[PDB]
Design a protein around this ligand. Structure first.
Ligand SMILES: *[C@@H]1O[C@H](CO)[C@@H](O[C@@H]2O[C@H](CO)[C@@H](O)[C@H](O)[C@H]2NC(C)=O)[C@H](O)[C@H]1NC(C)=O
Ligand SMILES: *[C@@H]1O[C@H](CO)[C@@H](O[C@@H]2O[C@H](CO)[C@@H](O)[C@H](O)[C@H]2NC(C)=O)[C@H](O)[C@H]1NC(C)=O
Ligand SMILES: *[C@@H]1O[C@H](CO)[C@@H](O[C@@H]2O[C@H](CO)[C@@H](O)[C@H](O)[C@H]2NC(C)=O)[C@H](O)[C@H]1NC(C)=O
Ligand SMILES: CCCCc1nc2c(N)nc3ccccc3c2n1Cc1ccc(CN)cc1
Ligand SMILES: CCCCc1nc2c(N)nc3ccccc3c2n1Cc1ccc(CN)cc1
Ligand SMILES: *[C@@H]1O[C@H](CO)[C@@H](O)[C@H](O)[C@H]1NC(C)=O
Ligand SMILES: *[C@@H]1O[C@H](CO)[C@@H](O)[C@H](O)[C@H]1NC(C)=O
Ligand SMILES: *[C@@H]1O[C@H](CO)[C@@H](O)[C@H](O)[C@H]1NC(C)=O
Ligand SMILES: *[C@@H]1O[C@H](CO)[C@@H](O)[C@H](O)[C@H]1NC(C)=O
Ligand SMILES: *[C@@H]1O[C@H](CO)[C@@H](O)[C@H](O)[C@H]1NC(C)=O
Ligand SMILES: *[C@@H]1O[C@H](CO)[C@@H](O)[C@H](O)[C@H]1NC(C)=O
Ligand SMILES: *[C@@H]1O[C@H](CO)[C@@H](O)[C@H](O)[C@H]1NC(C)=O
Ligand SMILES: *[C@@H]1O[C@H](CO)[C@@H](O)[C@H](O)[C@H]1NC(C)=O
Ligand SMILES: *[C@@H]1O[C@H](CO)[C@@H](O)[C@H](O)[C@H]1NC(C)=O
Ligand SMILES: *[C@@H]1O[C@H](CO)[C@@H](O)[C@H](O)[C@H]1NC(C)=O
Ligand SMILES: *[C@@H]1O[C@H](CO)[C@@H](O)[C@H](O)[C@H]1NC(C)=O
Lengths: 775, 774
RNA sequence: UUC
RNA sequence: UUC
């Protein structure tokens, strides 16, 4: 079907709308640019390789390049792999880019460059030099960048990539880049704001440096600036998980009261970790457009109770005041200034790490008439006492976040305490949807009762994950939560003694009781798995990692359940050969379409398991079970089966004729098994098959009988990588078909490889030439 | 060094005292008895193989056999592997055993046999036929067993191996085996006690059957019986995790009040799961040597407050009344009859599953003057309230077990609820420190010193698996002046204060593993230097805490010998460029054992080895994804004797091991990616005694890399599951492996050629390379 | 691969 | 393999 096989080890894409020819050679263990890159290539990506040099020959034919991404071919040693350290910095020979008349974007980050590469074409609009060893900027090295708009110079001098001197920038080095819009000088050991900067700037990143003071005229001309980030100058170093040097005498970053006067267009001001003790209202006199203000990791605990500057911020959308607590102080309560009531546009307020014992309703009164408020984040505050009914006055909010507290009767796990949360990787560049969410996860709730939720009938999602709840629920504990659609009860100690647990949550659609194994681990204890009968709109049930090996009831029942996750239990014990009592455990989940019973130690499946499945089962995972054998003909009982996941098991064979085992199967996942050959007529007449994963097995040969064209050409994807292909003359059909098929097969360039014979070991089958088999 | 390579795929051992030649072929994937078994073989084990038959040829030369263990060569289908189902039962041809004149133990369990094999030698003293399909015993099939002493016939008819009929035993079938001492008919669908049994019986196992009634004389003549087990006849089926049929009409096993009168020697009586509602005192009138009584899993809740029968048991050592609760009843308290006070000899009392809300000191008063009591087990009772000070009156006890309760302000995990806890396999803790209070798996969310009032005698406290989410400051355990062992694992310890635990001045072992909760949230203070104050601490476990940050940069202890730090994030703590924690363990000056496996250490920054404490002997870096290793930095570890690098991604060994460590005895490199050894790898590494290179990708090993003067000192050399290429280049290695004195495991099964073509799959021990010497 |  |  193909006349010319693609042997280039890069992915090639065509989006002819934008007439882009996209060549992506990311992470291909290349030591030179591969031959035969399309002449029409516009976007060429070579990041994460070991190409030691660039020369005029590098891009000789590729005159239409608009973007070269040549990052991370010589990463600085602390930043890069310690098993493949770059021995010598990337060599860029003269004239390598001057011929590239249409080049708009050049990324050379992570190559141990010592200077700004010269000879760049005047079409260039974006240059990226992060994670190099360039720490002196001279105006003469920037003359070539007359038309530049975006300049990334950061991460060239910091603790992971030291230069052992202060960063140097010549006076007015950037002034004559009259088109410059984005300047990033982060993580660079800079000591002063470089001046004078071009007045076209819209974004200026100076964070994680050694700037001790702002001059009153440092930002005088920047009347188009929208984003300014000065964070991490005079850092707050307490509990920093990176080497951190504070400004002497506990001093803050010193910012004159009029330093921001020119910045009428400013939308984002980031002053995180500047050891600030006050926020002068005068800072904001001429900024009436500010939408985002980050004041986290300062020393503003007192200021939060005063906060006159908030009166100047009526258009503010997002305010972050997290981690401003005074060292060694555990306050009694949270003192929020009345000034917070003037934040009329506020959507998001975060005050983690204020550290106080008791939250009381009146303490939130400055927020009552903030009509656009959507997120209130009070996590990581060691709160011990909180009457949850106070949120009856916050039904308009989307998320109330009290996660990680000590209450008892979406941001990443590392966020406020990382060095540079915006840093680029070498490779690239949740229940809120249900409605109002109260996040009580990771607290100390050991016992719950209905009155705890009084006046909270509006809640749609309650997150109780990771509390200490070791209690037999009987249907009385959540009675006010008449509207709840999603309950996360994971990581507790639920005792399913009563089949009436949760039945007061009459609108519940999703229940997560995963990782409640405690009471399932002790022998002889009653467990009622049939508690689902009473939940009349329950769509999804998660009970993963409960170690369930016994059940008092023999059947689960539901007229609504569509999805059951039952991973990490002991169905091998429940289904011990000779014990027929639980072979219909799921049969009466009449609407069940998706069943995950992976990781259940099922080394075999007893007869009756498939007959006992509910009638509309479509998607079954038996992954990671150590399955050693499988009666494929039993799939005939699953008349609606469309996806079968058997990955990560110990199967050695496929059925003689897949089509004779299931008339419905679309998606078959067999990756990571022990299969060494396919049956002679494996896929014969499997007209419904659309997706087949045979990767990471031990297959040596595949003949055409096993893989008929009329089936192969309906496949959306066929995965064959990481097998044991034997590239002898017996393999001529397979090698030819793989080279010439239009079926999608990933990793042809990297992991569809001959293991023999001797000559061809390690060779890609796509590059294989077998003419000697045709003499 | 050997002149004749051992090619037999069995382990051969000599005990020349008892002049036993022990040949063990367990689980060697044999389809025939191998040729060349020593003619002097006395013990031959063939269990877990696929030998389809036995014939006179089988043991024809092996005239000196005293024991044949030929179990599980055709396991019943439900009991065996479903990936290798035996297609047809073991065939035993006539005359196969009659020549074995010295044969005394024959194990034929697990072979789907249909009858008792005949032609057995008159020497036989033990015959084992478990897990077969023999469910009718006729006296004529047993005449051959005149001298037999031990007869195992169980597991021939039960739910995992059904026969679909009642078991049949002919009248007096066993009577004329006048030497029979042990009879096991368990798990067999038996309906009546077989009579008459020979009076030589010392042990009789009738449990898990369908016996509804004992007759008055079922045990009339058995005055030599020491163990009787009738458990599981009329079972209590509530929450049974196996198919369980109770006797009809809620009946118990019906035992006449005089049924045990003849049993003057009886020491062990097991009546577990017999649905008993009463225990008649008259049962025990003529047995007062009884030492062990199991009454668990009956309906004896009422009886426990009465229990007049206890007055007849003054020699009882061990009593079990667990799981006697009435269905759907949550009692307020435990009513123990005064009769318990007469159990003068009692060492072990177990009453799990009584199910009551509150334990009060008065309820235990009948036990106050039992001077030999050692174990009180009240686990799995759903107790909510218990003043722990009440155990001030039980300081003589070894273990007080309140585990798995709901308290708030060694037996296996499956024991009382398994079908047959004594069943055979085909193939085959802090009590030591003193008084132990086991509070594990309760609901304790907060602790205070007064909780431990009057418990200063405690040597080991187990708080594992409670709900303790608390910053300890050194005040919480003040009364426990003698505690040597604290298990605080699986809680939510908050190490805010470096004074945590410092009141436990005698503490030698601290387990704070699986307390990750407060370590998983960013920005929180943690004081890892809390070890300073514990001046006799020898062992500290802080596994699986996800530790990735620390406010203190050094831990110090002047006593700690063992630190377990597995399952943390030293990769984050030692992030390249951050030098602050590279001495975290340096000031544990007496540290000898350090486990930092499972720490995501894909590399070790320079300075980690310099930062190790000076006396480190045993270091685990296993399961780290380590991709590179500067072997020369081991020079800093001047006392290193064990280095565990298993389950990593290393590709090379050092060029000269001897230049890396002058002391290293034990190098574990299993489960890595090593594809060849360096040219002079072990040259002059005279101190090495143990090298595990198994599960790597090694193709060839030459004598340059493996000098004989080093290899022959090894206590063990592990090489299995590699990538061996058996060409003429391999002549030295193959010859050395065949003739070596050094122990190499799995030679018979997994030291194998992968090529070339001819030899693929062939064991190197059997390899013949004469064509290389033509 | 007798639990 | 810039976090
Ligand atoms: C940032 O610049 C400072 C100097 O401004 C560097 O500090 C010097 O480092 C060298 C070698 O480490 C020392 O000998 C000097 O005494 C230091 N000077 C001062 C004033 O401290 C620092 O190393 C630079 N940071 C990085 C990450 O390169
Ligand atoms: C080798 O076989 C003999 C014969 O069965 C085993 O000896 C028995 O050992 C037990 C251990 O207490 C004694 O009670 C029996 O009376 C012995 N039987 C005799 C002496 O005939 C011996 O244990 C076996 N050894 C091995 C290693 O398999
Ligand atoms: C134990 O014996 C009983 C009979 O005493 C067996 O039960 C019979 O089983 C057959 C086939 O399943 C039925 O047709 C009979 O009706 C049953 N009889 C009775 C009285 O129930 C039982 O199968 C045997 N148990 C085992 C494990 O084999
Ligand atoms: C964002 C807070 C980081 C520092 C910290 N760490 C902890 C911790 N591990 N546990 C606590 C438990 C209760 C109260 C405060 C803290 C605490 N705190 C706050 C704290 C407040 C007060 C004190 C008393 N000096 C010590 C610590
Ligand atoms: C060994 C006990 C097996 C049965 C059982 N299972 C549980 C369980 N999962 N949680 C409980 C929680 C509190 C009290 C009793 C039980 C209980 N119980 C005891 C029990 C259950 C039910 C009742 C009647 N409400 C009384 C007592
Ligand atoms: C291709 O390069 C252009 C110019 O730098 C850029 O705008 C576009 O996003 C790139 N597209 C892809 C798919 O890389
Ligand atoms: C809150 O703090 C501010 C400034 O510290 C103070 O003026 C005010 O009185 C405080 N209010 C309360 C209720 O503590
Ligand atoms: C919590 O506040 C609610 C709402 O005003 C009130 O009804 C209730 O009494 C309070 N409960 C507690 C325990 O303070
Ligand atoms: C509940 O909170 C836990 C703990 O932070 C989190 O992992 C989980 O995703 C949350 N659940 C939902 C449904 O958002
Ligand atoms: C459920 O339990 C609660 C708390 O123990 C109790 O108040 C209520 O009476 C119980 N309800 C039923 C129907 O058992
Ligand atoms: C669950 O099963 C038990 C029997 O084990 C029964 O008592 C109970 O009524 C059942 N509950 C529901 C809701 O079906
Ligand atoms: C099948 O279910 C799995 C979850 O186990 C899901 O990830 C996958 O996308 C589903 N596939 C289809 C085709 O529905
Ligand atoms: C399998 O194939 C045979 C022969 O073609 C046919 O009789 C049988 O009905 C088939 N079974 C299924 C489920 O397709
Ligand atoms: C403490 O109890 C746990 C849980 O039952 C047990 O696993 C652990 O071994 C015990 N600790 C000691 C030191 O015995
Ligand atoms: C430790 O904390 C407990 C409980 O909070 C308190 O009673 C005690 O005074 C504290 N001890 C010290 C030495 O601070
Ligand atoms: C542990 O270190 C902290 C500071 O990091 C110090 O305040 C504390 O006293 C130290 N404690 C011990 C026992 O060394």
């Amino acid at each position: 079907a193909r006349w010319f096989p693609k042997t280039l080890p890069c992915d090639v894409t065509l989006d002819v709308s934008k007439n882009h020819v996209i060549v992506d050679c990311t992470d291909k263990h290349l030591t030179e640019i591969p031959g035969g890159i399309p002449t029409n290539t516009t976007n060429l990506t070579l990041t994460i390789n070991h190409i030691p040099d660039i020369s005029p020959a590098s891009f000789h034919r590729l005159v239409h390049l608009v973007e070269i991404d040549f990052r991370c071919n010589c990463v600085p040693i602390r930043l890069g792999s310690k098993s493949n350290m770059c021995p010598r910095r990337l060599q860029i020979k003269p004239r390598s880019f001057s011929g590239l008349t249409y080049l708009k974007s050049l990324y050379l980050d992570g190559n141990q460059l010592l200077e700004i590469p010269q000879g760049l074409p005047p079409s260039l609009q974006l240059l990226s030099l992060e994670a190099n060893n360039i720490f002196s900027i001279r105006k003469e090295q920037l003359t070539e960048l007359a038309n530049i708009e975006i300049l990334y110079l950061g991460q060239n001098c910091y603790y992971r990539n030291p230069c052992y001197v202060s960063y140097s920038i010549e006076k007015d080095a950037f002034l004559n880049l009259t088109k410059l819009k984005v300047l990033s000088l982060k993580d660079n050991n800079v000591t002063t704001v470089p001046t004078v900067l071009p007045s076209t700037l819209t974004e200026l990143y100076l964070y994680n440096n050694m700037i001790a003071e702002i001059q009153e005229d440092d930002f005088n001309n920047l009347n188009q600036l929208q984003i300014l980030d000065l964070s991490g100058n005079c850092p707050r170093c307490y509990n920093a998980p990176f080497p951190c040097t504070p400004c002497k005498n506990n001093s803050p970053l010193q910012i004159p009261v009029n330093a921001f006067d020119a910045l009428t267009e400013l939308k984002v001001l980031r002053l995180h970790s500047n050891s600030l003790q006050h926020v002068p209202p005068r800072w904001f006199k001429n900024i009436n457009n500010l939408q985002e203000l980050d004041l986290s990791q300062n020393f503003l605990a007192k200021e939060i109770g005063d906060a006159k500057f908030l009166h100047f911020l009526p258009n503010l959308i997002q305010l972050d005041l997290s981690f401003n607590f005074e060292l060694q102080v555990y306050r009694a309560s949270m003192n929020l200034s009345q000034a917070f009531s003037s934040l009329k546009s506020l959507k998001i307020l975060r005050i983690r790490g204020y550290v106080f014992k008791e939250l009381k309703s009146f303490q939130l009164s400055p927020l009552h008439n903030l009509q656009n408020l959507e997120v209130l984040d009070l996590g990581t505050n060691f709160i011990k006492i909180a009457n949850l009914s106070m949120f009856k006055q916050f039904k308009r909010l989307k998320v109330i976040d009290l996660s990680v507290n000590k209450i008892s009767p979406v941001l990443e796990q590392l966020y406020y305490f990382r060095y540079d949360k915006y840093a680029r990787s070498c490779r690239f560049k949740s229940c809120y949807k249900y409605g109002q969410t109260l996040d009580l996860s990771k607290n100390s709730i050991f016992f719950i009762k209905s009155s705890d939720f009084q006046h909270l009938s509006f809640l749609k999602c309650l997150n109780l994950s990771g509390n200490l709840i070791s209690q037999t629920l009987n249907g009385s504990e959540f009675q006010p939560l008449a509207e709840l659609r999603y309950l996360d009860f994971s990581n507790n100690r639920l005792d399913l003694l009563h089949s009436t647990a949760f039945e007061e949550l009459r609108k519940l659609e999703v229940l997560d009781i995963s990782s409640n194994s405690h009471y399932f681990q002790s022998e002889g204890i009653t467990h009622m798995l049939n508690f689902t009968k009473n939940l009349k709109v329950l769509q999804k049930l998660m009970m993963n990692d409960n170690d369930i090996s016994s059940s008092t009831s023999r059947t689960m029942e539901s007229e609504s359940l569509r999805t059951l996750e039952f991973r990490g239990n002991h169905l091998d014990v429940l289904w011990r050969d000779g014990d027929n009592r639980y072979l219909q455990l799921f049969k009466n989940l009449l609407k069940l379409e998706e069943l995950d019973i992976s990781k259940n130690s099922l080394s075999f499946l007893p007869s009756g398991v498939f007959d006992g499945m509910p009638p509309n089962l479509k998607n079954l995972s038996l992954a990671k079970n150590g399955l050693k054998s499988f009666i494929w003909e039993k799939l005939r009982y699953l008349k609606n089966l469309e996806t079968l996941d058997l990955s990560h098991n110990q199967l050695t064979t496929v059925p003689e004729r897949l089509s004779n085992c299931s008339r419905s199967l679309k998606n078959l996942i067999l990756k990571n098994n022990q299969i060494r050959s396919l049956t002679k007529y494996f896929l014969q007449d499997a007209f419904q098959l659309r997706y087949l994963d045979l990767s990471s097995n031990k297959i040596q040969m595949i003949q055409k009988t096993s893989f008929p064209e009329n089936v192969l050409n309906n496949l959306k994807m066929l995965l064959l990588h990481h097998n044991r292909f034997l590239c002898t003359c017996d393999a001529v059909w397979f090698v030819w078909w793989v080279q010439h098929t239009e079926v999608t097969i990933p990793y042809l360039a990297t992991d569809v490889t001959c293991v023999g014979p001797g000559a061809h070991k390690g060779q890609s089958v796509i590059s294989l030439d077998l003419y000697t088999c045709e003499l």
